[PDB]
């Protein structure tokens, strides 16, 4: 039940709670934070001109096959992503790949 601490399903989809580190060598999931209930995501983009947000959304849109929007934390390392029109079961399956 590893990724479950970072996700919740609302009427609109799944809110995936992440904590980003920019300037990374590769955009990828590197861990979970068990106290904050967030997936640690490295993002291979600079945190300028919204480029880390853009890369983060692109990565998860490709992973889930669904539109991903930042609902909270646009200017924070702690960001909540709405994965629109997907279920928690589908998100867990994809995160576990
Ligand atoms: Na950014």
From Swiss-Prot:
SMART domains: DUF167. HAMAP family: UPF0235. It holds the Pfam family DUF167. GO terms for cellular component: cytoplasm. NCBIfam families: DUF167 family protein. This is UPF0235 protein PF1765. InterPro entries: DUF167, YggU-like_sf. It comes from the Archaea. It comes from Pyrococcus furiosus (strain ATCC 43587 / DSM 3638 / JCM 8422 / Vc1). Belongs to the UPF0235 family.
């Amino acid at each position: 039940l590893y990724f479950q601490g970072s996700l919740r399903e609302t009427s609109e989809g799944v809110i995936l709670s992440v904590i980003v580190a920019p300037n990374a060598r590769e955009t990828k999931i590197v861990g979970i934070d068990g106290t904050r209930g967030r997936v640690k995501v490295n993002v291979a983009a600079p945190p300028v001109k919204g480029k880390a947000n853009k890369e983060l959304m692109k990565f998860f849109k490709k992973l889930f096959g669904a539109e991903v929007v930042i609902v909270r934390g646009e200017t924070s390392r702690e960001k909540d992503l709405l994965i629109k029109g997907i279920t928690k079961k589908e998100v867990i399956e994809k995160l576990e790949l």
